Amino acid sequence: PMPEFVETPIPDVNTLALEDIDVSNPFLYRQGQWRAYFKRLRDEAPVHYQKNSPFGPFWSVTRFEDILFVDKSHDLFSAEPQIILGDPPEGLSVEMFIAMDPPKHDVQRSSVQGVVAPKNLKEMEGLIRSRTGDVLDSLPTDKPFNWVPAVSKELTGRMLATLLDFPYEERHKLVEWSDRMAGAASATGGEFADENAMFDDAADMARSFSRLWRDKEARRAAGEEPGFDLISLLQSNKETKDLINRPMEFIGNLTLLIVGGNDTTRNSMSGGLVAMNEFPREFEKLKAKPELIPNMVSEIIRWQTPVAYMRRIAKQDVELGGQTIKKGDRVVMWYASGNRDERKFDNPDQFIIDRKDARNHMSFGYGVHRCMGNRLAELQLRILWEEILKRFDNIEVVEEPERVQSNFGRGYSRLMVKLTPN
Ligand code: HEM
Ligand SMILES: CCCCCCCCCCCC(=O)O
């Protein structure tokens, strides 16, 4: 079985030989060493091969331009069979089109992408803004509180329930299933190492999603107006009316949607407060010019970079960065490094809400796999900060945030926040 990752002090990157830099360490982000580790890789070995890691050997691509090329070159780099650095526990690999190459990727993505179509997102705006306001007003203003479960996880869990028309009181299952899936120690160095519970969740997921398919189909056959959820959309198109006869296209598509939006949205909502705390002149600039929120949302997403990387496999030998990536080698596109590449962003470690090229960030990736839910993610963040400006004159992080163990997700498990209303 995959042993748990136990945290040990990560030394300064300059004490290491270039060949010994291992950025798969799932504690790099928590210990605040990722910036120095990736900067040295960008400057001295932008295409870096690590032959010794707990996940096996892999290439690290750390420069913005080189990540662009790898992400856009689905002719040279495959997203199959997995896009995380390591491997899922054997038997637990789920086929998701995020880890599929064209043309099969295009067919499956096209059958689900309507759930985040612009018209369908506008139909969700009122509920998103209603829930955001209902969560923010319920927050205490006389004492600090943990922002992660109070706001980030709360709003995220509701959004995921809306996307699937999942039972509202069972929405916590979607978060729990997604957390254990994305936090598998064998895949991302996360803290979930019990493979038995992963098989249990996969069984509960199949049963619960199947029962949801039946219930929606029965409700549809009874004349219930079709909603804006993925299930309603899938049962309204001829090509996916029988998707239940394809359990893997069914479970994989539904599993990808909830894992895709779970801790990404959660950590984007928390990360904006961390950036505001580290650069408070941007909060004054925001209150003076609230029209900057759309661009600030992009800058929040760039600065946080909730998904640290996507992994590829070289379909062939590929020359890149002066190195020869061999066919079959694993290649890791470090978005978290690309978004801090000063070759692309001036003062890249600085949170600048009116940054002219904030929209050019690679937190959503690029190419055929570029985040399908990116507009929904930006919509939730825009509404959250619109509703924050309506209510609060200042937001203070009163404690050192606690960061999640993972090399894949960059997020916070604890964010103590003190609110000051206006
Ligand atoms: C700020 C929040 C988010 C970030 C940073 C993010 C990040 C990413 C990244 C890096 C990829 C892979 C890009 C690539 O390989 O080139 C991706 C793909 C994807 N994301 Fe997100 N995501 C976010 C929110 C969401 C949400 C809210 C949803 C759905 C509700 C979602 C659904 C998906 C799906 C379905 C894919 C697969 C698309 C494909 O492979 O064609 N994401 N996302
Ligand atoms: C965003 C990608 C989802 C994370 C995939 C990691 C491993 C695939 C899931 C296999 C089942 C499991 O880990 O419990």
DSSP string across 157-190: HHHHHHHHT--GGGHHHHHHHHHHHHTBHHHHS-
State how far the Cα of 99 lies from the Cα of 219, in Å rounded to an integer: 33
- The partner residues of 392 in beta bridges, in order of sequence, read 421
What are the φ/ψ torsions at residue 280 (nearest 5 degrees)?
Answer: -70, -20
Domain assignment present for residue 268? The answer is yes
What are the φ/ψ torsions at residue 53 (nearest 5 degrees)?
Answer: -155, 160
Resolution (A): 2.2
Q: Which ligand is nearest to the CA of 179?
A: 2
Q: How was this structure determined?
A: X-ray
Q: Do the beta carbons of residue 139 and residue 419 sit within 8 Å?
A: yes
Q: How far is the CA of 183 from the centre of ligand 2 (A)?
A: 8
State how far the Cα of 232 lies from the Cα of 245, in Å rounded to an integer: 16
Q: How far is the CA of 121 from the centre of ligand 1 (A)?
A: 16
Q: What is the CATH number of the domain that holds 101?
A: 1.10.630.10
What is the enclosing helix (H) or strand (E) of 300? helix 293-304
Q: How far is the CA of 307 from the centre of ligand 1 (A)?
A: 9
Domain assignment present for residue 8? The answer is no
Q: What is the extent of the structural domain holding 329? A: 13-421
What is the enclosing helix (H) or strand (E) of 34? helix 34-44
State how far the Cα of 88 lies from the Cα of 193, in Å rounded to an integer: 11
Q: Which residues contact 130 (CB under 8 A, 6 or more apart)?
A: none
Q: Is 369 annotated as a binding residue?
A: yes
State how far the Cα of 7 lies from the Cα of 145, in Å rounded to an integer: 26
Q: Is 366 annotated as a binding residue?
A: yes
Angstrom CA distances, 384 to 97, 155, 161, 249, 379, stand at 29, 9, 18, 33, 9
State how far the Cα of 123 lies from the Cα of 138, in Å rounded to an integer: 25
Q: Is the CB of 257 under 6 A from ligand 2?
A: no
> How many structural domains does the chain have?
1
Domain assignment present for residue 80? The answer is yes
State how far the Cα of 264 lies from the Cα of 23, in Å rounded to an integer: 20
Domain assignment present for residue 165? The answer is yes
DSSP string across 330-380: EEEE-HHHHTT-TTTSSSTTS--TT-TTGGG--TT--STTS-TTHHHHHHH
Q: Each residue of 346-385: b (16+ CB within 10 Å) or e?
A: eebeebbbebeebeebbbbbbbbbebbbeebbbbbbbbbb
Domain assignment present for residue 152? The answer is yes
Q: Do the beta carbons of residue 185 and residue 54 sit within 8 Å?
A: no
Domain assignment present for residue 4? The answer is no
State how far the Cα of 233 lies from the Cα of 236, in Å rounded to an integer: 5
Q: Which residues contact 16 (CB under 8 A, 6 or more apart)?
A: none
Domain assignment present for residue 392? The answer is yes
State how far the Cα of 56 lies from the Cα of 93, in Å rounded to an integer: 18
Q: How far is the CA of 94 from the centre of ligand 2 (A)?
A: 7
First to last CA, the chain: 53
Q: Whose CA is nearest to atom 12 of ligand 2?
A: 181
* Residue where the block lists tokens 């963040």: 381
Q: Which sign, positive or negative, has the C-alpha torsion 386, 391, 394, 397?
A: negative
Domain assignment present for residue 1? The answer is no
Q: Is 361 annotated as a binding residue?
A: no
User: DSSP 3-state helix, strand, coil percentages of the chain (rounded to 5)?
Assistant: 50, 10, 40
Q: Which sign, positive or negative, has the C-alpha torsion 228, 304, 46, 85?
A: negative
